[PDB]
């Protein structure tokens, strides 16, 4: 009993925050 999908959109919009990053700074 698990399968985070009411938190999987929290995930790929967190990936928009891997754009928050885009790429390991300098």
From Swiss-Prot:
UniProt keywords, alphabetically: Antibiotic, Antimicrobial, Bacteriocin, DNA replication inhibitor, Plasmid, Thioether bond
Protein name: Bacteriocin microcin B17
GO terms (BP aspect): defense response to bacterium; killing of cells of another organism; negative regulation of DNA replication
Species whose genome carries this gene: Escherichia coli
Mod. after translation: The processed N-terminus does not resemble a typical secretion signal sequence. Maturation of thiazole and oxazole containing antibiotics involves the enzymatic condensation of a Cys, Ser or Thr with the alpha-carbonyl of the preceding amino acid to form a thioether or ether bond, then dehydration to form a double bond with the alpha-amino nitrogen. Thiazoline or oxazoline rings are dehydrogenated to form thiazole or oxazole rings.
Function summary: This glycine-rich peptide antibiotic inhibits DNA replication in many enteric bacteria, that leads to induction of the SOS repair system, massive DNA degradation and cell death. B17 inhibits type II topoisomerase by trapping an enzyme - DNA cleavable complex.
Residue ranges annotated as propeptide in the record: 1-26
